[PDB]
């Protein structure tokens, strides 16, 4: 499986600075997450269709991170230094590895237009964000517009995002919000990003081949080199028997869960030896 440690699917996939999992995996049979991970969306906001992404990412047969729009070279007339106190690494304001915070440069935020033709022969998971400032001052300071837009279109996706500024309860010390979006770009398709402000540009995208049909397990059980056909939240099970009373929510070729304490079939004769 894919052990995420203290990270949630969101944290791992967005590239939360506390998530990395060193030289990473390229295939997994299921996902292992903790009952309550402590590292997710370090900068607050809404993750669109999150339970759907979680399900689609359960089992993956092929998986490669690629710098869809390289940070160091893609935005010459924008600032890409944008970091947050809420997204800290060690003792410093950092940001998500897979996304880029684009703000003004030399008093302007010029229009952007960046397309990507899927040359991977696999689905490409493209993730972006939309920043929603708490006040019009910040909106103007960062994007130099009050009439901002973010268009994102493919042959199977088309959404225009306008930022909505508002007084909000602080979450991780932010009044501001970043709403997370994704799409699984089909082999051979082009995706176009076009904005005049508020785009949290995709930096890294993922070429993948979606597996069979798996799920996520939330367990503090240790990981092991053992091989199974049936996995339970508390440990693996011997799948040769027709029934089990271990756990109702399993992943694999599993015996049917039953509430029973015993299910023993007599083969021999009544033992009556005295």
């Amino acid at each position, epitope marked *: 499986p894919l052990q995420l440690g203290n990270c949630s699917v969101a944290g791992w996939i967005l590239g939360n600075p506390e998530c990395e999992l060193l030289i990473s995996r390229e295939s997994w049979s299921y996902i292992v997450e903790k009952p309550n991970p402590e590292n997710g969306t370090c900068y607050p906001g809404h993750f669109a269709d999150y339970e759907e992404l979680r399900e689609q990412l359960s089992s993956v047969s092929s998986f490669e991170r690629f710098e869809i729009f*390289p940070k160091e*070279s*893609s935005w*010459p007339n924008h600032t890409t230094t944008g970091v947050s106190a809420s997204c800290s690494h060690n003792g410093e304001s950092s940001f998500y590895k897979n996304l880029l915070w684009l703000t003004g440069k030399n008093g302007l935020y010029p229009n952007l237009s960046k*397309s990507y033709a*899927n*040359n991977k*022969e696999k689905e490409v998971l493209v993730l972006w964000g939309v920043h929603h400032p708490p006040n019009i001052g910040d909106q103007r300071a960062l994007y130099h517009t009050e009439n901002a837009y973010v268009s994102v279109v493919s042959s199977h996706y088309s959404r225009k995002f306008t930022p909505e500024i508002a007084k909000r309860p602080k979450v991780r010390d932010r009044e501001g919000r970043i709403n997370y979006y994704w799409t699984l770009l089909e082999p*051979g398709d082009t995706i176009i990003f076009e904005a005049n402000g508020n785009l949290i540009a995709p930096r890294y995208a993922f070429a993948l081949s979606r597996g069979f049909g798996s799920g996520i397990i939330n367990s503090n059980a240790p990981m092991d080199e053992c091989d199974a056909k049936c996995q339970t939240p508390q440990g693996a099970i011997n799948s040769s028997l027709p029934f089990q009373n271990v756990h109702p929510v399993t992943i694999g070729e599993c015996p049917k869960y039953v509430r029973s304490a015993k299910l023993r079939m007599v083969t021999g004769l009544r033992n009556i030896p005295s």
Partner: antibody
Amino acid sequence: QVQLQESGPGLVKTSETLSLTCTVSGGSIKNKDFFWAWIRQPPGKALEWIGSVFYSGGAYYNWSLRNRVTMSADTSKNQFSLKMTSVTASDTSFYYCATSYVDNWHAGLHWFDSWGRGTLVTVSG
Amino acid sequence: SVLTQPPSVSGAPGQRVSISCTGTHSNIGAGFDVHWYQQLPGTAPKLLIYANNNRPSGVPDRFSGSKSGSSASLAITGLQAEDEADYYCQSFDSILSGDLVFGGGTKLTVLG
């Protein structure tokens, strides 16, 4: 190991539409590692990139031409094409077809190889 | 032409010529590799140098490439009459859509 050949030279009426086809030999156009190019050059002048197309029809275009050009690929005939609308005399050029080995497009490390002979397209009333 | 080339350079046979290709913050200055093409009278261009300093097969050790900062240079040592052609440098520009760009070209004249 691949050889490229542009369609025949000809005339295009002013304000009309220019069509060209390149034919790939010595290999398949259906290769994930190439983006097929159309370059042009007005006689005596410099080279200009028009666009590059993946076999699926996914393309990148020269910003200044983005709204006049369209490129496609035909994996059966092993050909890729160019369609340019509202032609001006400025569109009178040598039209070349080439190809690029591409890993990550926005890394910008790719060049052009396997160039064709070129085809003179003359724009006139 | 987003990349700037001297309209012309010349050299006597056996001398070293250097054709410069000077760019901006959005192309060479952004970290994009530089490639060169040789164009002989009335022929289609051909690749001469790829990935800043690499020579394809059939290109002699006389032809070399270098890139520093936001500028590149094609150098030809021990100039031969056969080298008399146009020379184009090519790179990439990320300012807008992410485009492939060419230099204006340089006509090399071999003397004597």
